């Protein structure tokens, strides 16, 4: 339990580490896409970590990148096939970042730092925990962005819009690039104020 929750606030992959930022600023526009991305990242990272741990003893070590990318890419391709089969609209919304999950620095970070020198079960659980932390950041950013940019949560109208005879005027910036940057920065600010040990000297 401690290791699963460790990368949520104590060692968050995006707040403390800088892994997985690229997907955070792109798929957070909607909570549906953000949540599906969290699930996909958790699944891919956990399975890749488990397999790499299973093959953590006999690897070329000369094409290390090729081998540790083959498993990740196969898993990401299978996940892409599933997402295009089930939840095709979500796959379309994710656009190209479904593929980028192979290069998502979280997966390699936990494949090399942990899965290469750990037992398969703890490697899988650590991958699940890191995916959970990344998805926590993703869901917070996406919640704020969707709520303040469309007045909707998971596609359900929460704040009535003037265009639909409501009262709330959507904030367009929440649907653009800088909003994700600012939200991540301020979330890091809050996390590091509540956890001063992470403050950088």
């Amino acid at each position: 339990k401690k290791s699963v929750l460790a990368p949520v606030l104590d060692n968050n992959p995006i707040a403390l580490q800088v892994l997985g930022v690229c997907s955070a600023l792109a798929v957070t526009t909607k909570l549906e896409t953000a949540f599906v991305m969290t699930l996909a990242v958790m699944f891919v990272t956990a399975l890749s970590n488990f397999f790499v741990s299973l093959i953590r003893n006999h690897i070329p070590n000369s094409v290390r990148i090729i081998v540790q990318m083959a498993i990740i890419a196969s898993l990401v391709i299978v996940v892409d096939q599933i997402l295009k089969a089930y939840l095709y609209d979500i796959s379309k919304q994710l656009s190209v970042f479904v593929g980028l999950i192979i290069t998502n620095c979280i997966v390699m970070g936990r494949a090399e730092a942990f899965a290469m020198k750990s037992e398969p079960i703890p490697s899988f659980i650590d991958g699940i925990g890191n995916g959970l932390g990344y998805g926590f950041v993703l869901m917070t950013v996406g919640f704020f962005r969707e709520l303040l940019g469309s007045g909707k949560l998971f596609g359900l109208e929460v704040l009535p819009l003037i265009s639909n005879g409501g009262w709330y005027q959507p904030n367009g910036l929440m649907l653009l690039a800088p909003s994700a940057f600012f939200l991540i920065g301020f979330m890091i600010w809050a996390i590091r104020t509540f956890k001063p040990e992470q403050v950088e000297a």
């Binding site: 005027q169 904030n171 367009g172 910036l173 929440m174 600012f182």
Partner: protein, 396 residues
């Protein structure tokens, strides 16, 4: 008690009276210039622009109302908007025969609320940051607030102004340490926040004239639509001459319209040395060069290609941005050659956005932000060349 308010109290005490501080070391005699006087000089430089902006906004609103409505209908609308009947109660008249006094009063009714809201909200954020961080309140917020209030449509909602100034002060300035420690322009940061977050209230045809129910495109949009021949003032039905744009008798933000008032204030501050004439010269050089290039190339489908440089100067917020926004010293480059490059980049980028960017009729703010991003690179190039000279002992 009340120590938590000390940071604010001192700000008042230092504002009314100069501190009795004396030099402790280094040079025992200091220059009479202080940040307070520089900020107040910049604040006074836009006073002619602010007053003429109020007058122009009032005149445009009155002309549009008289051109649209008449008779009892006019009275009804005058009773429907608090600006109009507040002007009436104060002695002003909404009729076409209104003098300069009534127009200025209506412009005040439209501007003073925005300026007051911006000042209060931004000052609350600044003072909150100072008290929480045990800093001393700076005077840059005065210039930031006035400039932000002078670059928004007269019909901007008060809450939108509050959000814009909050973004410009907190995200762009305070998180970077406050006055003198940021790299972006707070006023333009807030204006861009409003530009990209609530484009409906800071763009189009229904916001640049204070007359409710009136839809009129500005000079820049009209030029883009149909070239120089399309520059017609619907409210008065009279063509917008170059002199009209230069004086500032056109729809637009409060204080941006008049190139003459901005020229006077900019000349005063530039003579005082507060504003870098190198940045202004660079902006002029870039705008002139790119405008002449586009004119030479020409275009049968894009009218903007045929706009002369002098029309670029007097249209939109080019003058205001060049004088009181491009000259922001903190966001500008810190080297003279870097200042020239920064100004040239600002001018070129503004002309590019004006001409070859259909989405944005004007690109002064976007150009300034883009050049703010790259001013450190010009500084880096200049210092690298200087260091290369130094390592050669200056050829000695």
């Amino acid at each position: 008690k009340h120590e938590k308010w000390f940071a604010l109290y001192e700000a008042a005490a230092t504002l009314f009276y100069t501190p009795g501080l004396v030099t402790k070391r280094s040079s025992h005699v200091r220059d009479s210039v202080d940040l307070k006087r520089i900020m107040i000089m910049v604040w006074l430089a836009v006073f002619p622009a602010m007053f003429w902006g109020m007058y122009n906004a009032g005149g445009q609103a009155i002309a549009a109302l008289n051109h649209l409505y008449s008779g009892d209908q006019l009275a009804a609308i005058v009773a429907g908007n608090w600006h109009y009947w507040l002007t009436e109660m104060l002695g002003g008249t909404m009729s076409s025969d209104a003098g300069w006094g009534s127009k200025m009063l209506l412009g005040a009714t439209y501007f003073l609320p925005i300026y007051a809201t911006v000042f209060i909200v931004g000052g609350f954020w600044e003072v909150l940051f100072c008290m929480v961080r045990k800093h001393e309140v700076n005077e840059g917020f005065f210039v930031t607030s006035i400039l932000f209030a002078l670059i928004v449509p007269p019909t901007l909602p008060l809450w939108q102004a509050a959000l814009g100034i909050t973004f410009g002060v907190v995200v762009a300035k305070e998180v970077f340490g406050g006055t003198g420690r940021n790299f972006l322009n707070p006023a333009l940061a807030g204006r861009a926040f409003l530009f990209f977050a609530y484009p409906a209230q800071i763009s189009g045809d229904l916001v640049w004239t204070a007359a409710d129910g009136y839809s009129g495109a500005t000079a820049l949009s009209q030029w883009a639509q149909g070239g120089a021949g399309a520059l017609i003032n619907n409210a008065t039905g009279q063509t917008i001459t170059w002199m009209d744009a230069f004086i500032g008798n056109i729809p637009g933000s409060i204080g941006e319209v008049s190139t003459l008032a901005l020229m006077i204030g900019a000349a005063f501050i530039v003579y005082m040395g507060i504003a870098s004439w190198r940045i202004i010269g660079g902006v002029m050089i870039g705008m002139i060069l790119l405008s002449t290039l586009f004119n030479v190339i020409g275009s049968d489908t894009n009218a903007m290609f045929n706009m002369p440089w002098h029309w670029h100067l007097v249209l939109g917020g080019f003058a205001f941005g060049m004088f009181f926004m491009a000259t922001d010293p903190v966001s500008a480059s810190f080297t003279n050659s870097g200042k020239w490059a920064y100004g040239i980049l600002i001018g070129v980028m503004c002309v590019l956005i004006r001409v070859v960017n259909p989405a944005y009729p004007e690109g002064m703010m976007l150009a300034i932000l883009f050049a703010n991003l790259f001013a450190p690179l010009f500084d880096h190039v200049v210092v690298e060349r200087n260091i290369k000279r130094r390592l050669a002992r200056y050829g000695k």
